[PDB]
PDB file of all heavy atoms in Angstrom:
ATOM      1  N   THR B   9       4.008 -25.465  -0.145  1.00 30.82           N
ATOM      2  CA  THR B   9       4.922 -24.915  -1.087  1.00 30.82           C
ATOM      3  C   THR B   9       4.163 -25.037  -2.375  1.00 30.82           C
ATOM      4  O   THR B   9       3.355 -25.961  -2.555  1.00 30.82           O
ATOM      5  CB  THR B   9       6.239 -25.732  -1.101  1.00 30.82           C
ATOM      6  OG1 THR B   9       7.206 -25.011  -0.338  1.00 30.82           O
ATOM      7  CG2 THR B   9       6.785 -25.993  -2.528  1.00 30.82           C
ATOM      8  N   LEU B  10       4.373 -24.062  -3.235  1.00 28.61           N
ATOM      9  CA  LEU B  10       3.718 -24.056  -4.531  1.00 28.61           C
ATOM     10  C   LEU B  10       4.532 -23.084  -5.316  1.00 28.61           C
ATOM     11  O   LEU B  10       4.632 -21.929  -4.939  1.00 28.61           O
ATOM     12  CB  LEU B  10       2.269 -23.576  -4.426  1.00 28.61           C
ATOM     13  CG  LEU B  10       1.637 -23.283  -5.779  1.00 28.61           C
ATOM     14  CD1 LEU B  10       1.615 -24.540  -6.614  1.00 28.61           C
ATOM     15  CD2 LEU B  10       0.231 -22.705  -5.633  1.00 28.61           C
ATOM     16  N   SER B  11       5.165 -23.580  -6.362  1.00 24.66           N
ATOM     17  CA  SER B  11       5.947 -22.767  -7.277  1.00 24.66           C
ATOM     18  C   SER B  11       5.141 -22.488  -8.529  1.00 24.66           C
ATOM     19  O   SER B  11       4.162 -23.211  -8.818  1.00 24.66           O
ATOM     20  CB  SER B  11       7.190 -23.546  -7.701  1.00 24.66           C
ATOM     21  OG  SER B  11       6.837 -24.572  -8.606  1.00 24.66           O
ATOM     22  N   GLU B  12       5.576 -21.467  -9.277  1.00 25.07           N
ATOM     23  CA  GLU B  12       4.943 -21.084 -10.527  1.00 25.07           C
ATOM     24  C   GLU B  12       5.003 -22.266 -11.487  1.00 25.07           C
ATOM     25  O   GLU B  12       4.041 -22.520 -12.217  1.00 25.07           O
ATOM     26  CB  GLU B  12       5.593 -19.810 -11.146  1.00 25.07           C
ATOM     27  N   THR B  13       6.108 -23.017 -11.474  1.00 25.92           N
ATOM     28  CA  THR B  13       6.228 -24.114 -12.391  1.00 25.92           C
ATOM     29  C   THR B  13       5.212 -25.205 -12.075  1.00 25.92           C
ATOM     30  O   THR B  13       4.576 -25.662 -12.979  1.00 25.92           O
ATOM     31  CB  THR B  13       7.612 -24.759 -12.364  1.00 25.92           C
ATOM     32  OG1 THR B  13       8.583 -23.776 -12.701  1.00 25.92           O
ATOM     33  CG2 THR B  13       7.684 -25.898 -13.362  1.00 25.92           C
ATOM     34  N   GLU B  14       5.101 -25.632 -10.808  1.00 25.01           N
ATOM     35  CA  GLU B  14       4.157 -26.703 -10.436  1.00 25.01           C
ATOM     36  C   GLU B  14       2.764 -26.268 -10.818  1.00 25.01           C
ATOM     37  O   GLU B  14       1.968 -27.091 -11.241  1.00 25.01           O
ATOM     38  CB  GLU B  14       4.165 -27.025  -8.943  1.00 25.01           C
ATOM     39  CG  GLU B  14       5.494 -27.535  -8.383  1.00 25.01           C
ATOM     40  CD  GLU B  14       5.565 -27.429  -6.862  1.00 25.01           C
ATOM     41  OE1 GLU B  14       5.636 -26.302  -6.336  1.00 25.01           O
ATOM     42  OE2 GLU B  14       5.547 -28.478  -6.192  1.00 25.01           O
ATOM     43  N   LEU B  15       2.462 -24.968 -10.703  1.00 24.34           N
ATOM     44  CA  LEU B  15       1.114 -24.509 -11.056  1.00 24.34           C
ATOM     45  C   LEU B  15       0.888 -24.609 -12.548  1.00 24.34           C
ATOM     46  O   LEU B  15      -0.185 -25.036 -12.969  1.00 24.34           O
ATOM     47  CB  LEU B  15       0.787 -23.107 -10.491  1.00 24.34           C
ATOM     48  CG  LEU B  15      -0.672 -22.664 -10.489  1.00 24.34           C
ATOM     49  CD1 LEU B  15      -1.591 -23.620  -9.735  1.00 24.34           C
ATOM     50  CD2 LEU B  15      -0.788 -21.265  -9.886  1.00 24.34           C
ATOM     51  N   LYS B  16       1.920 -24.309 -13.349  1.00 24.86           N
ATOM     52  CA  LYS B  16       1.907 -24.474 -14.824  1.00 24.86           C
ATOM     53  C   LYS B  16       1.632 -25.934 -15.246  1.00 24.86           C
ATOM     54  O   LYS B  16       0.787 -26.205 -16.094  1.00 24.86           O
ATOM     55  CB  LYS B  16       3.248 -23.940 -15.452  1.00 24.86           C
ATOM     56  N   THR B  17       2.356 -26.868 -14.619  1.00 22.64           N
ATOM     57  CA  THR B  17       2.155 -28.301 -14.797  1.00 22.64           C
ATOM     58  C   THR B  17       0.731 -28.682 -14.454  1.00 22.64           C
ATOM     59  O   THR B  17       0.105 -29.435 -15.156  1.00 22.64           O
ATOM     60  CB  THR B  17       3.106 -29.107 -13.892  1.00 22.64           C
ATOM     61  OG1 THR B  17       4.456 -28.749 -14.222  1.00 22.64           O
ATOM     62  CG2 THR B  17       2.913 -30.579 -14.082  1.00 22.64           C
ATOM     63  N   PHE B  18       0.235 -28.157 -13.338  1.00 24.99           N
ATOM     64  CA  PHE B  18      -1.116 -28.453 -12.948  1.00 24.99           C
ATOM     65  C   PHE B  18      -2.116 -27.898 -13.974  1.00 24.99           C
ATOM     66  O   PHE B  18      -3.039 -28.597 -14.379  1.00 24.99           O
ATOM     67  CB  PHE B  18      -1.354 -27.866 -11.592  1.00 24.99           C
ATOM     68  CG  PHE B  18      -2.757 -28.034 -11.087  1.00 24.99           C
ATOM     69  CD1 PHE B  18      -3.149 -29.193 -10.451  1.00 24.99           C
ATOM     70  CD2 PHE B  18      -3.666 -26.993 -11.214  1.00 24.99           C
ATOM     71  CE1 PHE B  18      -4.435 -29.329  -9.969  1.00 24.99           C
ATOM     72  CE2 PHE B  18      -4.953 -27.115 -10.703  1.00 24.99           C
ATOM     73  CZ  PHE B  18      -5.329 -28.288 -10.107  1.00 24.99           C
ATOM     74  N   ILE B  19      -1.959 -26.663 -14.383  1.00 24.71           N
ATOM     75  CA  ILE B  19      -2.951 -26.099 -15.330  1.00 24.71           C
ATOM     76  C   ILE B  19      -2.841 -26.786 -16.707  1.00 24.71           C
ATOM     77  O   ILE B  19      -3.864 -26.999 -17.350  1.00 24.71           O
ATOM     78  CB  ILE B  19      -2.901 -24.571 -15.478  1.00 24.71           C
ATOM     79  CG1 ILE B  19      -2.041 -24.157 -16.617  1.00 24.71           C
ATOM     80  CG2 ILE B  19      -2.441 -23.798 -14.241  1.00 24.71           C
ATOM     81  CD1 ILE B  19      -2.400 -22.786 -17.080  1.00 24.71           C
ATOM     82  N   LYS B  20      -1.594 -27.114 -17.137  1.00 25.03           N
ATOM     83  CA  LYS B  20      -1.385 -27.950 -18.349  1.00 25.03           C
ATOM     84  C   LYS B  20      -2.199 -29.192 -18.293  1.00 25.03           C
ATOM     85  O   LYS B  20      -2.791 -29.584 -19.271  1.00 25.03           O
ATOM     86  CB  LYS B  20       0.063 -28.437 -18.516  1.00 25.03           C
ATOM     87  N   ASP B  21      -2.179 -29.855 -17.138  1.00 26.05           N
ATOM     88  CA  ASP B  21      -2.940 -31.075 -16.962  1.00 26.05           C
ATOM     89  C   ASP B  21      -4.483 -30.833 -16.918  1.00 26.05           C
ATOM     90  O   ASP B  21      -5.250 -31.720 -17.324  1.00 26.05           O
ATOM     91  CB  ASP B  21      -2.439 -31.841 -15.722  1.00 26.05           C
ATOM     92  CG  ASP B  21      -3.176 -33.221 -15.518  1.00 26.05           C
ATOM     93  OD1 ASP B  21      -3.129 -34.061 -16.451  1.00 26.05           O
ATOM     94  OD2 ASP B  21      -3.798 -33.466 -14.436  1.00 26.05           O
ATOM     95  N   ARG B  22      -4.950 -29.648 -16.488  1.00 21.20           N
ATOM     96  CA  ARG B  22      -6.386 -29.476 -16.210  1.00 21.20           C
ATOM     97  C   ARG B  22      -7.193 -28.662 -17.261  1.00 21.20           C
ATOM     98  O   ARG B  22      -8.403 -28.802 -17.369  1.00 21.20           O
ATOM     99  CB  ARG B  22      -6.535 -28.884 -14.797  1.00 21.20           C
ATOM    100  CG  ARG B  22      -6.078 -29.807 -13.624  1.00 21.20           C
ATOM    101  CD  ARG B  22      -7.286 -30.472 -12.978  1.00 21.20           C
ATOM    102  NE  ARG B  22      -7.004 -31.167 -11.739  1.00 21.20           N
ATOM    103  CZ  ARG B  22      -7.906 -31.321 -10.796  1.00 21.20           C
ATOM    104  NH1 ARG B  22      -9.099 -30.841 -10.998  1.00 21.20           N
ATOM    105  NH2 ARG B  22      -7.629 -31.971  -9.689  1.00 21.20           N
ATOM    106  N   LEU B  23      -6.559 -27.790 -18.031  1.00 20.88           N
ATOM    107  CA  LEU B  23      -7.255 -26.885 -18.970  1.00 20.88           C
ATOM    108  C   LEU B  23      -6.732 -26.938 -20.396  1.00 20.88           C
ATOM    109  O   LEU B  23      -5.539 -27.130 -20.615  1.00 20.88           O
ATOM    110  CB  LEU B  23      -7.037 -25.403 -18.525  1.00 20.88           C
ATOM    111  CG  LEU B  23      -7.690 -24.879 -17.219  1.00 20.88           C
ATOM    112  CD1 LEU B  23      -7.072 -23.569 -16.714  1.00 20.88           C
ATOM    113  CD2 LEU B  23      -9.197 -24.689 -17.446  1.00 20.88           C
ATOM    114  N   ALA B  24      -7.604 -26.608 -21.338  1.00 23.32           N
ATOM    115  CA  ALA B  24      -7.221 -26.441 -22.719  1.00 23.32           C
ATOM    116  C   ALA B  24      -6.305 -25.239 -22.868  1.00 23.32           C
ATOM    117  O   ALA B  24      -6.463 -24.245 -22.139  1.00 23.32           O
ATOM    118  CB  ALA B  24      -8.473 -26.274 -23.592  1.00 23.32           C
ATOM    119  N   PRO B  25      -5.357 -25.283 -23.836  1.00 20.98           N
ATOM    120  CA  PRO B  25      -4.413 -24.180 -23.922  1.00 20.98           C
ATOM    121  C   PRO B  25      -5.061 -22.795 -24.184  1.00 20.98           C
ATOM    122  O   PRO B  25      -4.511 -21.814 -23.771  1.00 20.98           O
ATOM    123  CB  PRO B  25      -3.475 -24.597 -25.099  1.00 20.98           C
ATOM    124  CG  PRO B  25      -3.599 -26.082 -25.182  1.00 20.98           C
ATOM    125  CD  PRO B  25      -5.032 -26.383 -24.783  1.00 20.98           C
ATOM    126  N   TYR B  26      -6.225 -22.784 -24.858  1.00 22.57           N
ATOM    127  CA  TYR B  26      -7.035 -21.593 -25.133  1.00 22.57           C
ATOM    128  C   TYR B  26      -7.555 -20.946 -23.837  1.00 22.57           C
ATOM    129  O   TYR B  26      -7.847 -19.773 -23.834  1.00 22.57           O
ATOM    130  CB  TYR B  26      -8.201 -21.876 -26.186  1.00 22.57           C
ATOM    131  CG  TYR B  26      -9.447 -22.652 -25.762  1.00 22.57           C
ATOM    132  CD1 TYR B  26     -10.556 -21.980 -25.234  1.00 22.57           C
ATOM    133  CD2 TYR B  26      -9.552 -24.061 -25.936  1.00 22.57           C
ATOM    134  CE1 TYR B  26     -11.696 -22.690 -24.823  1.00 22.57           C
ATOM    135  CE2 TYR B  26     -10.736 -24.787 -25.566  1.00 22.57           C
ATOM    136  CZ  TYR B  26     -11.813 -24.101 -24.998  1.00 22.57           C
ATOM    137  OH  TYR B  26     -13.010 -24.726 -24.583  1.00 22.57           O
ATOM    138  N   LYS B  27      -7.627 -21.711 -22.755  1.00 22.09           N
ATOM    139  CA  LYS B  27      -7.879 -21.163 -21.401  1.00 22.09           C
ATOM    140  C   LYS B  27      -6.690 -20.777 -20.505  1.00 22.09           C
ATOM    141  O   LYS B  27      -6.915 -20.245 -19.396  1.00 22.09           O
ATOM    142  CB  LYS B  27      -8.750 -22.137 -20.680  1.00 22.09           C
ATOM    143  CG  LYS B  27     -10.037 -22.413 -21.434  1.00 22.09           C
ATOM    144  CD  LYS B  27     -10.762 -23.508 -20.777  1.00 22.09           C
ATOM    145  CE  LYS B  27     -12.037 -23.835 -21.541  1.00 22.09           C
ATOM    146  NZ  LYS B  27     -12.710 -24.940 -20.808  1.00 22.09           N
ATOM    147  N   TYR B  28      -5.442 -21.002 -20.917  1.00 21.93           N
ATOM    148  CA  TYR B  28      -4.320 -20.780 -19.969  1.00 21.93           C
ATOM    149  C   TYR B  28      -4.168 -19.313 -19.579  1.00 21.93           C
ATOM    150  O   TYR B  28      -4.150 -18.440 -20.452  1.00 21.93           O
ATOM    151  CB  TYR B  28      -2.943 -21.169 -20.530  1.00 21.93           C
ATOM    152  CG  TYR B  28      -2.640 -22.627 -20.847  1.00 21.93           C
ATOM    153  CD1 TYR B  28      -1.557 -22.970 -21.722  1.00 21.93           C
ATOM    154  CD2 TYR B  28      -3.419 -23.694 -20.326  1.00 21.93           C
ATOM    155  CE1 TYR B  28      -1.255 -24.315 -22.019  1.00 21.93           C
ATOM    156  CE2 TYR B  28      -3.114 -25.009 -20.649  1.00 21.93           C
ATOM    157  CZ  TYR B  28      -2.058 -25.309 -21.486  1.00 21.93           C
ATOM    158  OH  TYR B  28      -1.870 -26.659 -21.763  1.00 21.93           O
ATOM    159  N   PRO B  29      -3.941 -19.028 -18.281  1.00 21.99           N
ATOM    160  CA  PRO B  29      -3.518 -17.686 -17.947  1.00 21.99           C
ATOM    161  C   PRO B  29      -2.184 -17.389 -18.582  1.00 21.99           C
ATOM    162  O   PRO B  29      -1.346 -18.250 -18.666  1.00 21.99           O
ATOM    163  CB  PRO B  29      -3.364 -17.709 -16.434  1.00 21.99           C
ATOM    164  CG  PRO B  29      -4.116 -18.894 -15.942  1.00 21.99           C
ATOM    165  CD  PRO B  29      -4.169 -19.876 -17.096  1.00 21.99           C
ATOM    166  N   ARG B  30      -1.996 -16.167 -19.031  1.00 20.44           N
ATOM    167  CA  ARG B  30      -0.734 -15.741 -19.605  1.00 20.44           C
ATOM    168  C   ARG B  30       0.348 -15.649 -18.563  1.00 20.44           C
ATOM    169  O   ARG B  30       1.517 -15.824 -18.866  1.00 20.44           O
ATOM    170  CB  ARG B  30      -0.894 -14.363 -20.253  1.00 20.44           C
ATOM    171  CG  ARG B  30       0.406 -13.628 -20.543  1.00 20.44           C
ATOM    172  CD  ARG B  30       0.102 -12.283 -21.197  1.00 20.44           C
ATOM    173  NE  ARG B  30       1.335 -11.760 -21.812  1.00 20.44           N
ATOM    174  CZ  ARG B  30       1.853 -10.561 -21.584  1.00 20.44           C
ATOM    175  NH1 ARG B  30       1.242  -9.711 -20.762  1.00 20.44           N
ATOM    176  NH2 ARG B  30       2.969 -10.198 -22.201  1.00 20.44           N
ATOM    177  N   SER B  31      -0.029 -15.325 -17.328  1.00 20.12           N
ATOM    178  CA  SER B  31       0.903 -15.387 -16.208  1.00 20.12           C
ATOM    179  C   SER B  31       0.055 -15.490 -14.926  1.00 20.12           C
ATOM    180  O   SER B  31      -1.147 -15.210 -14.955  1.00 20.12           O
ATOM    181  CB  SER B  31       1.781 -14.164 -16.115  1.00 20.12           C
ATOM    182  OG  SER B  31       1.056 -12.984 -15.850  1.00 20.12           O
ATOM    183  N   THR B  32       0.687 -15.956 -13.873  1.00 23.67           N
ATOM    184  CA  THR B  32       0.096 -16.013 -12.555  1.00 23.67           C
ATOM    185  C   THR B  32       0.906 -15.154 -11.609  1.00 23.67           C
ATOM    186  O   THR B  32       2.107 -15.223 -11.647  1.00 23.67           O
ATOM    187  CB  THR B  32       0.159 -17.429 -12.077  1.00 23.67           C
ATOM    188  OG1 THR B  32      -0.641 -18.213 -12.950  1.00 23.67           O
ATOM    189  CG2 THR B  32      -0.338 -17.513 -10.628  1.00 23.67           C
ATOM    190  N   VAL B  33       0.272 -14.335 -10.787  1.00 21.40           N
ATOM    191  CA  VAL B  33       0.969 -13.579  -9.752  1.00 21.40           C
ATOM    192  C   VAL B  33       0.534 -14.163  -8.414  1.00 21.40           C
ATOM    193  O   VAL B  33      -0.685 -14.245  -8.152  1.00 21.40           O
ATOM    194  CB  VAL B  33       0.596 -12.103  -9.851  1.00 21.40           C
ATOM    195  CG1 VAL B  33       1.343 -11.258  -8.812  1.00 21.40           C
ATOM    196  CG2 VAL B  33       1.004 -11.585 -11.233  1.00 21.40           C
ATOM    197  N   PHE B  34       1.499 -14.538  -7.558  1.00 23.93           N
ATOM    198  CA  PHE B  34       1.231 -14.843  -6.151  1.00 23.93           C
ATOM    199  C   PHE B  34       1.082 -13.592  -5.312  1.00 23.93           C
ATOM    200  O   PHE B  34       1.935 -12.767  -5.323  1.00 23.93           O
ATOM    201  CB  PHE B  34       2.310 -15.759  -5.611  1.00 23.93           C
ATOM    202  CG  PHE B  34       2.283 -17.151  -6.276  1.00 23.93           C
ATOM    203  CD1 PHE B  34       2.961 -17.372  -7.436  1.00 23.93           C
ATOM    204  CD2 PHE B  34       1.463 -18.142  -5.804  1.00 23.93           C
ATOM    205  CE1 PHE B  34       2.864 -18.582  -8.110  1.00 23.93           C
ATOM    206  CE2 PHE B  34       1.386 -19.384  -6.446  1.00 23.93           C
ATOM    207  CZ  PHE B  34       2.091 -19.592  -7.602  1.00 23.93           C
ATOM    208  N   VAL B  35      -0.001 -13.468  -4.571  1.00 24.27           N
ATOM    209  CA  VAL B  35      -0.250 -12.328  -3.686  1.00 24.27           C
ATOM    210  C   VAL B  35      -0.593 -12.848  -2.286  1.00 24.27           C
ATOM    211  O   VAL B  35      -0.939 -14.027  -2.099  1.00 24.27           O
ATOM    212  CB  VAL B  35      -1.386 -11.449  -4.282  1.00 24.27           C
ATOM    213  CG1 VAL B  35      -0.970 -10.967  -5.646  1.00 24.27           C
ATOM    214  CG2 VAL B  35      -2.699 -12.246  -4.405  1.00 24.27           C
ATOM    215  N   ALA B  36      -0.477 -11.974  -1.283  1.00 24.65           N
ATOM    216  CA  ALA B  36      -0.746 -12.362   0.087  1.00 24.65           C
ATOM    217  C   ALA B  36      -2.229 -12.355   0.408  1.00 24.65           C
ATOM    218  O   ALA B  36      -2.647 -13.035   1.302  1.00 24.65           O
ATOM    219  CB  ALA B  36      -0.025 -11.391   1.056  1.00 24.65           C
ATOM    220  N   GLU B  37      -2.997 -11.546  -0.310  1.00 22.74           N
ATOM    221  CA  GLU B  37      -4.447 -11.494  -0.107  1.00 22.74           C
ATOM    222  C   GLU B  37      -5.096 -10.910  -1.354  1.00 22.74           C
ATOM    223  O   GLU B  37      -4.436 -10.269  -2.169  1.00 22.74           O
ATOM    224  CB  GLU B  37      -4.801 -10.661   1.130  1.00 22.74           C
ATOM    225  CG  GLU B  37      -4.424  -9.215   0.990  1.00 22.74           C
ATOM    226  CD  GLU B  37      -4.662  -8.339   2.225  1.00 22.74           C
ATOM    227  OE1 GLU B  37      -5.284  -8.738   3.258  1.00 22.74           O
ATOM    228  OE2 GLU B  37      -4.219  -7.218   2.100  1.00 22.74           O
ATOM    229  N   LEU B  38      -6.398 -11.041  -1.475  1.00 23.32           N
ATOM    230  CA  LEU B  38      -7.106 -10.380  -2.547  1.00 23.32           C
ATOM    231  C   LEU B  38      -8.049  -9.318  -1.952  1.00 23.32           C
ATOM    232  O   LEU B  38      -8.580  -9.510  -0.876  1.00 23.32           O
ATOM    233  CB  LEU B  38      -7.957 -11.417  -3.266  1.00 23.32           C
ATOM    234  CG  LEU B  38      -7.188 -12.552  -3.965  1.00 23.32           C
ATOM    235  CD1 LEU B  38      -8.102 -13.700  -4.335  1.00 23.32           C
ATOM    236  CD2 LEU B  38      -6.560 -11.932  -5.192  1.00 23.32           C
TER     237      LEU B  38
END
């Protein structure tokens, strides 16, 4: 399970705000 919020918390913890994605889209494949 992975929600958009948990991913936000994770990126908050790992990257400078100048690097944050503006949004994340979940897709089934790339």
Side-chain angles (χ1 to χ4, degrees), residues 9-11 13-15 17-19 21-38:
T9 259
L10 168 61
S11 74
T13 301
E14 298 162 291
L15 195 57
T17 301
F18 177 84
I19 94 158
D21 183 58
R22 294 260 190 152
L23 291 163
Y26 75 89
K27 303 172 182 180
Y28 294 161
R30 164 179 196 234
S31 64
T32 296
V33 182
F34 294 87
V35 301
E37 65 184 352
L38 297 165

